[PDB]
Write an enzyme that holds these catalytic residues in place. Structure first.
Site, mmCIF file in Angstrom:
data_model
loop_
_atom_site.group_PDB
_atom_site.id
_atom_site.type_symbol
_atom_site.label_atom_id
_atom_site.label_comp_id
_atom_site.label_asym_id
_atom_site.label_seq_id
_atom_site.Cartn_x
_atom_site.Cartn_y
_atom_site.Cartn_z
ATOM 1 N N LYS A 294 -4.262 -10.238 -7.584
ATOM 2 C CA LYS A 294 -4.935 -9.651 -6.433
ATOM 3 C C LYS A 294 -5.997 -8.754 -7.032
ATOM 4 O O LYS A 294 -5.698 -7.952 -7.919
ATOM 5 C CB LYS A 294 -3.992 -8.849 -5.542
ATOM 6 C CG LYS A 294 -4.702 -8.407 -4.283
ATOM 7 C CD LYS A 294 -3.837 -7.596 -3.341
ATOM 8 C CE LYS A 294 -4.711 -7.245 -2.128
ATOM 9 N NZ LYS A 294 -4.032 -6.332 -1.151
ATOM 10 N N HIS B 23 -3.277 -3.439 7.674
ATOM 11 C CA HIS B 23 -4.348 -3.779 6.749
ATOM 12 C C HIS B 23 -4.959 -2.496 6.196
ATOM 13 O O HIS B 23 -5.152 -1.527 6.935
ATOM 14 C CB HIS B 23 -5.385 -4.643 7.487
ATOM 15 C CG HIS B 23 -6.724 -4.681 6.838
ATOM 16 N ND1 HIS B 23 -7.000 -5.456 5.724
ATOM 17 C CD2 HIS B 23 -7.879 -4.023 7.126
ATOM 18 C CE1 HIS B 23 -8.260 -5.272 5.366
ATOM 19 N NE2 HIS B 23 -8.813 -4.413 6.197
ATOM 20 N N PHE B 24 -5.229 -2.481 4.895
ATOM 21 C CA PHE B 24 -5.924 -1.371 4.260
ATOM 22 C C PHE B 24 -7.407 -1.721 4.145
ATOM 23 O O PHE B 24 -7.791 -2.621 3.382
ATOM 24 C CB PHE B 24 -5.345 -1.068 2.871
ATOM 25 C CG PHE B 24 -5.751 0.269 2.335
ATOM 26 C CD1 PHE B 24 -6.974 0.436 1.694
ATOM 27 C CD2 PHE B 24 -4.924 1.370 2.494
ATOM 28 C CE1 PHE B 24 -7.362 1.679 1.223
ATOM 29 C CE2 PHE B 24 -5.294 2.616 2.028
ATOM 30 C CZ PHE B 24 -6.526 2.776 1.391
ATOM 31 N N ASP B 25 -8.240 -1.010 4.897
ATOM 32 C CA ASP B 25 -9.650 -1.355 4.964
ATOM 33 C C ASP B 25 -10.423 -0.736 3.808
ATOM 34 O O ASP B 25 -11.153 -1.426 3.099
ATOM 35 C CB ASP B 25 -10.238 -0.918 6.306
ATOM 36 C CG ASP B 25 -11.517 -1.658 6.655
ATOM 37 O OD1 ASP B 25 -11.448 -2.881 6.918
ATOM 38 O OD2 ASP B 25 -12.591 -1.023 6.677
ATOM 39 N N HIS C 4 0.745 -1.252 0.000
ATOM 40 C CA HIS C 4 0.000 0.000 0.000
ATOM 41 C C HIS C 4 0.779 1.308 0.000
ATOM 42 O O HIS C 4 0.165 2.374 -0.118
ATOM 43 C CB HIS C 4 -0.990 0.002 1.170
ATOM 44 C CG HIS C 4 -1.875 -1.201 1.209
ATOM 45 N ND1 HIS C 4 -2.774 -1.493 0.194
ATOM 46 C CD2 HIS C 4 -1.994 -2.204 2.103
ATOM 47 C CE1 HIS C 4 -3.421 -2.592 0.485
ATOM 48 N NE2 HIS C 4 -2.964 -3.063 1.647
#
Length: 124
Positions: free
Chosen positions: A41, A119-121, A12
């Site tokens: 992905k 984590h990228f929400d 990210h």
């Protein structure tokens, strides 16, 4: 294995550019960051801000993660991001991505000491 923190950075973070350069930004980065090796992905966002600025989000607006976790944080301000999303002409091993530049809030989940994004929400 990768640490969760390092996996967030690899997936990210792109502090090298102020924004996506070309429509091919996503195809290049998804490959480069090894996000097309085992499969395409499907969705992935890159953040064009310094690592310190993104890490700082872990001390910004506490919000719920989409799965209901309590350790998500929304950035107070918007950030330059690029959303990368697999398109209809995409088929592993030939992954194809749409590049969408935007300036939006980011939401990340954080863990650890130091408390950093793992984590990228979402973006808003």
């Amino acid at each position: 294995k990768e640490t969760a923190a390092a996996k967030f950075e690899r997936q990210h973070m792109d502090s090298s550019t102020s924004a996506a350069s070309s429509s091919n930004y996503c195809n290049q980065m998804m490959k480069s960051r090894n996000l097309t090796k085992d499969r395409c992905k499907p969705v992935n966002t890159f953040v064009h801000e310094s690592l310190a600025d993104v890490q700082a989000v872990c001390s910004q607006k506490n919000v719920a993660c989409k799965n209901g976790q309590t350790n998500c944080y929304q950035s107070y301000s918007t950030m330059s991001i690029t959303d990368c999303r697999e398109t209809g002409s995409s088929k592993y091993p030939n992954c194809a991505y749409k590049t969408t530049q935007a300036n939006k809030h980011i939401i990340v989940a954080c863990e650890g000491n130091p408390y950093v994004p793992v984590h990228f929400d979402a973006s808003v």
